[PDB]
Amino acid sequence: FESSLLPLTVPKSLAVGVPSITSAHFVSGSLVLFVISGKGYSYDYYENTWRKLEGISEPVSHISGDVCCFKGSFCLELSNNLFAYLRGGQIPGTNIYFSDNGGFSFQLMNTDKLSHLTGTLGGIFHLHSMSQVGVLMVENNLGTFHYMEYPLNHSMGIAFSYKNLLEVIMKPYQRGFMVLWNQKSILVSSNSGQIVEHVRLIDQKIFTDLDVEHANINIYSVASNAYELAFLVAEDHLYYGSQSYMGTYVIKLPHQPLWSTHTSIYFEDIGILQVLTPVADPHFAAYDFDKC
Amino acid sequence: KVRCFFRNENQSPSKEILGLFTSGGLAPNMIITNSTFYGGYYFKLTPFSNRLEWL
Numbered sequence: 001f002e003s004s005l006l007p008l009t010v011p012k013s014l015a016v017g018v019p020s021i022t023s024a025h026f027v028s029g030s031l032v033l034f035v036i037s038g039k040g041y042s043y044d045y046y047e048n049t050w051r052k053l054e055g056i057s058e059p060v061s062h063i064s065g066d067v068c069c070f071k072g073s074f075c076l077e078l079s080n081n082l083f084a085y086l087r088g089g090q091i092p093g094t095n096i097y098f099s100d101n102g103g104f105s106f107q108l109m110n111t112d113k114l115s116h117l118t119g120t121l122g123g124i125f126h127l128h129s130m131s132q133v134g135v136l137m138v139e140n141n142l143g144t145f146h147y148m149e150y151p152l153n154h155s156m157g158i159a160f161s162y163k164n165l166l167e168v169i170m171k172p173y174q175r176g177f178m179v180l181w182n183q184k185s186i187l188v189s190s191n192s193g194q195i196v197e198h199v200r201l202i203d204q205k206i207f208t209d210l211d212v213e214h215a216n217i218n219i220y221s222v223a224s225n226a227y228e229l230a231f232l233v234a235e236d237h238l239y240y241g242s243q244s245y246m247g248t249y250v251i252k253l254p255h256q257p258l259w260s261t262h263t264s265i266y267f268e269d270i271g272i273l274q275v276l277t278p279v280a281d282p283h284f285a286a287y288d289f290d291k292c
Numbered sequence: 293k294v295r296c297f298f299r300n301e302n303q304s305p306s307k308e309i310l311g312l313f314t315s316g317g318l319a320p321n322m323i324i325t326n327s328t329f330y331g332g333y334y335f336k337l338t339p340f341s342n343r344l345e346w347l
């Protein structure tokens with residue numbers, strides 16, 4: 001995010017009507033996959049070439065995948081597998097899609113595989129860490145994980161509450177860690193979704209369970225790392241914590257007015273958090289970036 | 293035959309600690325020692341879907 005960049009735009013030939021990015025994902029190579037208005041698209045950052053995706057027929061909300069890049073063919077073929085799904089869709093009647101090669105071709109995935117399931121679909125995930133395919137399945141106010149593969153085949157994890165929806169973040173190194181967060185809640189999983197537990201907050205060296213909705217804080221952004229987790233709460237709050245085995249402990253950082261309605265945080269490196277805000281310049285139409 | 297459970301700040305048996313140690317692939321060991329004896333017995337790894345404690 002050095003220098004100034006013009007905002008990313010649709011070329012307008014392949015008019016996609018509204019241009020709302022429901023999700024974005026970094027596939028192997030120079031391609032980036034966007035879900036715009038329920039349709040998949042691929043953008044090559046070295047070019048300006050936009051390619052619509054033909055495999056996905058029904059509208060999809062999210063594209064999910066896992067990326068390894070140890071230098072070999074293995075992490076490449078691991079990166080190729082992808083899922084396309086509509087988050088929140090009815091368990092039966094929604095159509096899930098799978099991609100065997102990058103994101104280039106998408107094939108519909110057959111129902112018989114999950115008849116034994118009824119309810120909303122929080123997400124479908126390929127868990128290469130556990131060599132397992134896990135579906136986040138919401139059958140009531142509580143949500144669970146189901147694993148399709150032999151051992152545990154159709155084995156339910158321990159249920160966790162799930163009012164509203166959640167966004168799922170997978171840790172890069174396939175250690176098995178997961179972050180499920182929305183505006184009013186943040187759940188973490190040391191396991192691969194089997195046990196989903198609240199985060200513990202440290203205040204004056206006493207640790208206690210944290211419920212975001214209970215404390216009335218509204219989280220505006222989250223930054224996720226291989227071993228670490230931070231989030232910025234809309235009322236100028238910043239929490240940093242170390243996600244690990246035996247639970248996750250989060251400390252509230254000293255106060256600073258870091259929220260400006262365009263700010264977002266990310267982890268540049270282990271131990272370095274970065275607060276980024278695009279400032280708009282009227283004359284040049286290219287945005288400056290205010291970094292802290 | 294013995295039933296054993298890991299004890300933390302919660303004195304009662306907990307199905308989360310068992311799940312954690314089983315999902316890492318860790319199970320307890322019993323070490324029986326004497327003046328002239330040393331023996332080791334391993335608790336068999338089992339899913340924590342039902343078991344509340346090691347046996």
Ligand SMILES: *[C@@H]1O[C@H](CO)[C@@H](O)[C@H](O)[C@H]1NC(C)=O
Nearest residue numbers: 148149150151152153154155
């Ligand atoms: C799937 O798992 C169930 C129980 O988890 C078992 O009864 C069944 O035989 C398994 N079937 C296959 C095809 O793996």
Ligand SMILES: *[C@@H]1O[C@H](CO)[C@@H](O)[C@H](O)[C@H]1NC(C)=O
Nearest residue numbers: 336337338339340341342343
């Ligand atoms: C195998 O796993 C099932 C699943 O909970 C369990 O009920 C059963 O007791 C296990 N069998 C043995 C021999 O450990």
